[model samples]
Target: TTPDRVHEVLGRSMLVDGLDIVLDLTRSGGSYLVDAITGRRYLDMFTFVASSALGMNPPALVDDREFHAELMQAALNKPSNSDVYSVAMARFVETFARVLGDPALPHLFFVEGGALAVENALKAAFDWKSRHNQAHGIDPALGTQVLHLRGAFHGRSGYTLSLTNTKPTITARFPKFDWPRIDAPYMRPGLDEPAMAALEAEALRQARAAFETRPHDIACFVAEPIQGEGGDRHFRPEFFAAMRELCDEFDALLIFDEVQTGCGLTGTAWAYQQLDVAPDIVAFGKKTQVCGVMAGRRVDEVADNVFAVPSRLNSTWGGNLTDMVRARRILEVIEAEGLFERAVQHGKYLRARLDELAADFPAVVLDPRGRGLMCAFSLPTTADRDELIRQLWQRAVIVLPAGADTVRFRPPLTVSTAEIDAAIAAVRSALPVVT
Candidate 1:
């Protein structure tokens, strides 16, 4: 279809200006995407909102007769409450528990996507607290409250929306849950070791104060190991270690929303592994090829009654046979190909390259920061950042923004050095346009 006609039809169909352009995807292989309408090839640095960590149409995952046949068989059997679905679900849970690299988070529950995963995990956390309150003969009202960081972005679900603090545009119109938030401190550059310690000390004090302020009311404290949507802001590992102590002191469940940071994007299987903090609940999605929550064994023991009834905390597509099968296959590919280690090595190189860009275009580019393949850099202004993204898109390299002035580079594990160089070149070429 012609661009104008397509635009008119799309405008009439649904939300018209939701995105900058209507990318009519024809085919994709590895890191490149082909537009069906215009035949313009794009090197996908964004990776469909960082969902496809193995890249577009990975060879091992492309065509498998066995996978398709099993899926068909499962579909033909029953939609839910079937042996096939249960088996697939069990296998994925087992596989993912190992991948998470923490034995504490062993009990898994599936959801359709990241947002739902957050909602599920939050509900589980609350129920766990409720059960504990009941057993101890405490007030049930205390178990309902939850806490999140100031700039966290869990999701847009009715429950998770309250925790999401990215932009007012996403959170403003909706009626939010009455929950409290602790301020998360950003360590400024050039601060001395003592100053850094002081900053973290104050942040830690405030975090502990939040619990004190509400007493036993705050049942859960949710955080991302590294702030992704709020800009790739990484805090010191000491901060998380301290938060763990605070959660323990308050008897509140610590939840890590690793939806964008999990599945080996941050060098480790989960970002918390690197931070030396183990959360009571870990919500994972995006690049996992599936989404779910992994609760700690202790939480499972406490919240046993929460799932006592059948279909408690249930979703129609939770742990569907096809998604589980594909997720299992994706994990197999990641391990067999050693993509985790590959990401570690390649990410180091990519970070250095981006640092070079910052050095080259200091007026326009800010410091580059991230862990593993989840790298990003900031521009002087949001206008500069958006302009650079648009210019890069026109140059056939797709990238996206994070926070206000930051542009993220979340290529797949399958992204090669050549692709990285091409992305770097694209940035180099586009930098001048914005500058």
Candidate 2:
């Protein structure tokens, strides 16, 4: 459908609108999309903003039609709180526990979306802090605050809005919590090595100072392993190590919000694994087919921890039978097909090609930063970036913009070498006009 036609229909029939373009979708399979109105096919590089990591209509889901039919029947017949839900929840948690690696983040709770998953994580962290304070003979609810990084985006929920200030549109006019946020340093040095180190030192100094000022008031320090929506801002491993140190010193829980970085998108099951440090809580969603948070054994190992409270963290739709089944199936496919290793190799190939493009179009193509299939590069301005997206669309390739002037590539893990080459060719053809 044309944009105007879609807008006309939406204006009359729908109350909400946010998209900038309208594509009448007929079918999608693997890493390609078909626009029904135009009868044109396009390579899907964005993959529904990285939500379809395994690609559209994955073989794992399509080939097992009979199994899915049975599951659907069970889902429709069972009560929302039926035993089916519980069994699926337990089994999924056990499988995901192995995915988290050593010492095992053994506890899990489900939510319906990434935002809700993060919201629940914050609650869990706060409750843990309250329980700790009570154990020390202090007021349980007196002082507990969450700290986040500047320009970070957790979600759009009221509580999450307080933490996310990446865009004014996300936080403007909303009642926000007076939460503290630490500033992030420039991704690349503006001047020289000394200048960069000095900047890093100052950022760390300010972060440590903020935590020390009111250590007792801080409940947890939440961070993204890689700031995905914030222009693919990748920080050094040392930065996270410093954060872990500060959290230890302040007796605050460290939470890694991996909603966008988990599920092998970053060439690993979770981004934190690459950093070689563990978080007290890890909130993940997006590609998992289900949203949830897992608590580390180290933090909640003790009996009677805050999570021990029965039905304290409850959601009717969390880990429903069908969702759990789909999630488990996705994981199985990732492992069976060796997608993780493929991601690493394909990521290297794509990034090398992207770097070549950056060299060719030096002015328009800025820094290319990414891990595995989750990749992006920035342009000089937002207008240039938008034009690039438009030009690429005309070339039958789909991608999305992130932050202000960045083009992100989130191809499905099943994206082949031929598909990567096609995307590169489309971008190369569009580069002149975009520039």
Candidate 3:
């Protein structure tokens, strides 16, 4: 079985010849992958950008096969809200906060997807500011704004488009917030250690300046714990704790968009756990078994302001009983399989191998940085990175781009030592050929 064969079957199955494709293998044995369509085997290293923590065809999930049936039946039955107020969604949200060491586990408002999550967060902030002002007799014109990291990928919603800094495609037509955009640390040359340190500090200062400059308007400072599509860039945990301090200083909420970093991809249930400070609202999707936002103290206390009205913020599939069920099942599987711990071990294993590759070919690879499975190494040039990806695909290993010129490794958490060796070997074999 080849990728072509799998593509053919999937194309027929999904009835979409071109669906912006990314595929994963789901097999019934020993964790080895066979293409979902063609039944061919390949080492899936990207794990759909670190979202597939428990790996494909996980038994813990398979055992609950009834969930899918229930989902279909619920739809067929046209069931309204279940008496069950999504215990799993609420529990998962609380469990997530507990894992991150938040004592006050905030309420969660389910959204349909990541982009919707960001959009809602923006709406929430705006509504909160308006009502808060009404209550206090302050000016309603004093609007709120969200601060986003340069090069961070929060989502693709119009609000997220405004927040995202990577691709200019989004911001071309969208109105952007006046919030400051600062330089995100990319391992560039010409800046020595001292210069780099000072510049990074200055970037933080500039961010604070942006927030404080309009103290009455800024609602949240948003960041992805590990910038996903922007770059598999890992900032020092201290850096985020510093940002948290800055948010507190400016009286703005800290919003960590964990849409890509959540689940067990970072060897922690919550990525912010590594960063130390709890965000006021952390939007998540991609791997929560469903798409939604987890709100903290800031957003929850004023839910009526944020999502109270029908037109203010709503999604048809947001908090649907099926999605909640899936999310709960995913959570149970993650804990039972201890995917977080597996992510740590397998991620380190792959990193060690990638480190070896860099050492073997220093000029070609640099700036290999990330936490756990969400790792990437920048190539000497964009051409090198593009060629490496092309060659890796030719070699039948699925690797993808990180930043401008970086190759990322994000194998599923259930990936075995053998799979790690395979991904490493394929990259090692492909590098010299491509470079």
Candidate 4:
């Protein structure tokens, strides 16, 4: 068969009950690769939530003699905190702020992983509120509560799940917001423009009411710029900006959950940059190669306030040196290669193509929407979406589910038109014939 006809996924799958398996490729990456089974190379679509910024096995990251040598030496050397390499940890955060044009990011609390970052941000919000309260003459012992939108997901941590909006993850131990959990403004069936506006206004109003009724009881509100695994859900920048204002009015902090959308995914290095609002606590991960929060208005110096110290909010492995080095490398790669701009271009193309597909299958594919390369399309049911994902995998195009009844596309910025075409062709071939 010709290269265009090669489908590695189907070629590799056993399709047996409870035993389905796909052959492991030694590691095929980027838009093209040689199939380990048939030895026929083909193009790829999704790139593991678009984390592979430089494409698979890109020469810049792997073949670079110096980078590999540096990585290897760093792995073994375990540079001291006072060493030059250790200094890269701090400078990396500065470079991030410099690149984003935001000078307020002075203090960093790094963790070995993103969930830990989420946990820390939750703690920071709690303690920051305590500081504000104690400064205003309130007892600092009272716990600070947090509010999160319905379908909101920060991380898999206990606090994150407690603030999470979805129902499937609910457990007895992690109590959720009993206060009004506002429904987000997403394009649903027959939702008129006026209806959508009213929904948003009501959600905003309820969020405000919840705070006004309890003042300073809530520490902050947590949410994502574009809800990645929560179904690629995107909110209008104005909505977040309004939330920022509301939180300010109530003396509560605004925490942005940018774990999945940070590091140039939303046509910018940080998705919060797309939002007109400035979050007091920004939790980032999945592409910084490191995870943490750039917290507080002033991250340096604390005094007579009788609270707010490093011991009050710190992680054992926060700001890991290797992770920091990798993060620096990630930032350098995105800037030098212009991955953010590339995400915008590729995202537009992918969205337009999905729109075309939805039009062709209007009954099944209802709504397709998102920003940058982070996108999701709604289906009539979760089963239909799952079938499509299963076929996509069988057709050699990797993809994942997002939100209810939606499938997401978060490919690396390095993806090309040929790869997009291949992804479309795979969908055309794998989709069941509907009459």
Candidate 5:
């Protein structure tokens, strides 16, 4: 569509001027969008801010006549899930639990959005601590503190904002707690194994020191398994292993915010699976088509009162039938088509491509880093990164920036090699002009 027309449409709302790109999209296929006014096709690497799981208008939902009928059937109910769930919700939760692949985490609480999912996990932690305290004849509200990571981005809401330390400006205006946040054991791009190990140990030392501040008063230590918004940063498995040890020692819950990295983006259903650590709570959403927190076996057995206490964890329309069914179908198609392996294979190909892209444009793009399909590389400056995004958009390709100067790629999990090559080709065509 024309830029003026896009502005006109967006001007009707309060969000016209703040948007990065304003394309009025008509429809979408697997990995592309059709512009409304101009009818130009654009390859969508962002995919609704990394929320789409299986590309656009997937056959799993569109072509399946049975699901269409069931979709309407499920949509009929708008209220009462905590009390009155349906056959569809039941089926979806069953699948959700199974693919989460941890029998230890059997209790799942479906919330409304990613932020609430994370907040609910915090609530569970608080409740678990409460239950633990009550069992030992201590006060329930003993632990009121939370430990997070410096490069973490849990959410923008009031509760999770305390742990959100990525951009200070975003949290500066909001009223949030002064919670302690330790440094993430980030896997550096240029570092070798020995140096990376040293960094990891240093970060863990910092983490242990953070625990000293609140000590037994801390309820949970939350982190993203692969810090998504912090420039798509990753960490070694031992980092999480040390976190697990610390959480166990401190009697604090370990919550992994898998909102962006879950549901088959990082070569596994849950990114924590690849890291070989079992968090006490896994907060998930974005790609799963639903938002919720899954609890481990300890919470399941000891802290049933967390979610079950009548008014404590109730929601008006949490995990309604429609979203539950759609989420289930997404997981179903992902597993049925073997998309876990697809994520691994696609990561391999994309890593090679980004490495070559970085090498060719050494001055323009550097630090090729990622795991599975969640990948990114650093630009020379923030202006250069924004310009490349603008150029890519002009060439009918969509990508977004992360952190200060890194370009992030979160294409649909079902993206084909042809589409990826096409996007990379656009990058190649645009980099020279920027340089």
Candidate 6:
């Protein structure tokens, strides 16, 4: 009842809130939530970044007797790391390799969280770059650079904080590095092939300049296939293809931080799978049930890029076994239930509704963009976006915002057509207020 009191006694530095939406949930189930304080059951389009993949208290986990048994035993025990590999841990490692379905990224390493997983990937990138510098007899003393894109948000801790070049409100207070970043040429509604190609080329020219700046010292180029926190921005396949060619030429690794877009959020099992070029290393969490990094087979050139060295990437409690079990089970459910297909079908429906919304309030609603179920539309101003979110909440509908003026939707993969219909109606009704 009193988060303020807990905020005072517990670590107060990190207590956070979302959208001023009062959370007094008596229960959350399916694609809606019951807020006891507000005494209303609301359609939940926010889904908190789709981390709740199957929605709250999913029957897939709860109804499974075998899952509950393993869960109870795993929960009662201390979390074991890769150091003290139990039979379950070994089995899980084997299971994850298949679940990932990426032989190119065969080497998997689990960690405590996404930020930590990303840091490990950076460590690998750093090591890979240092070894190359040494091989060329260059002074390894020169600091390596992490090339990235503008409107990218990787993480907010340690090295990741520097790369998270999104909102000033989030990153302004923290001291961070000045990494080289290029503008992401996000496509507009009316762009044809020629304009898009030219946009991509100019963007690549700047990307080329970044690589040329520290030819030998650039460790890696880190980015999301689709930017989530910065805005629901996306890139064309050609851009990633060119990045791959540049990485190969420059001897730098390509790392995709799929912390938000991974694990069936983007209709694909992994977002990059939809792209033409594959990344050498991928850091994933959120909705995956646990955070981990997958180093591709090409990384053998960098000696698996720091993963080969024992104790180099190992954390004290590497990961929670329960989380791992949960992830494995979730993967099972996703495969069994064809959630990926469902995501695409629902995305088409959602995208149609948003375009209709834009037409309904053309001045108030800006670009209605989507990639699978991960969708967004920008408001005329930041205040407009905030008001839209607040007004939706007032109608007991949950939608979140990204960037400055973009309203982002993150419905569960298991979300139904009726649930989508209800949420859109809530949005349709809320828009008149914000308008």
TM-scores of all candidate predictions against the true structure: 0.93, 0.92, 0.84, 0.85, 0.94, 0.93
Q: Model 2 segments beyond 4 Å from truth?
A: 1-9, 15-26, 74-78, 81-90, 100-102, 189-195
> What does candidate 5's lDDT look like per residue over 1-435, in tens digits?
465477677677766554344445336678987766566778988888899988778877898999888888888757578778678888888888777657777767887899999999998888888787678787776777788888789888989878888888868877887777776778766788999888888878877787787656688888888888888888889888988998888788889899999988888888998888988888998988779888874576564557666677767877666888888888888878999899899888988999999788788778888888999988888889889988998898988788989899998889888888998899999998877
Evaluate all candidate structures by whole-model CA lDDT and list the values in order: 0.80, 0.79, 0.69, 0.68, 0.83, 0.81
lDDT of 2 by residue, 28-83 (tens): 68888766556667788987778877877776777897657756755674345422
- CA shift of 414, model 5, Å: 1.0
Superposed model 4: Cα runs more than 4 Å off: 1-27, 32-46, 77-91, 167-180, 189-193, 298-308
User: Residue by residue across 1-435, what tens digits does model 6's lDDT show?
Assistant: 363354344445776543433444436687877664445677888776667788777889888998888878778886667667776666667777776658788778888788888888988888877876776787776536798888888877888888888877767778877778887887876788899999989888988888787668788899899988887888888889988998888888899998889888888878989996789899988887679899874577765357777776778778888787787787888888888989999989989988998898888878898888999999889988989888887877888789888889999898887887887887788877876
lDDT assessment of candidate 6: 0.81
Clashes of each: 0, 0, 0, 6, 1, 0
Tens-place lDDT per residue, model 1, 324-351, is 6777778888888999899998999899
Residue 322 in model 2: lDDT: 69
Error of 2 at 137 (Å): 3.4
Question: Against the correct fold, how does model 3 do in TM-score?
Answer: 0.84
lDDT string for model 3 (252-292, tens) is 67777888888778888778887788887777777765566
TM-score of 2: 0.92
Q: Which structure among the candidates has the greatest TM-score?
A: 5
RMSD (CA, Å), each prediction: 2.4, 2.7, 4.1, 5.5, 2.3, 2.6
Give the true-structure RMSD of model 4: 5.5
Native-referenced Cα lDDT, model 4: 0.68
Among all windows of ten consecutive residues in candidate 6, which has the lowest summed lDDT? Answer: 17-26
**lDDT, candidate 5, at 236:** 87
Best by lDDT: 5
Q: Give the TM-score comparing model 4 with the true structure, all chains together.
A: 0.85
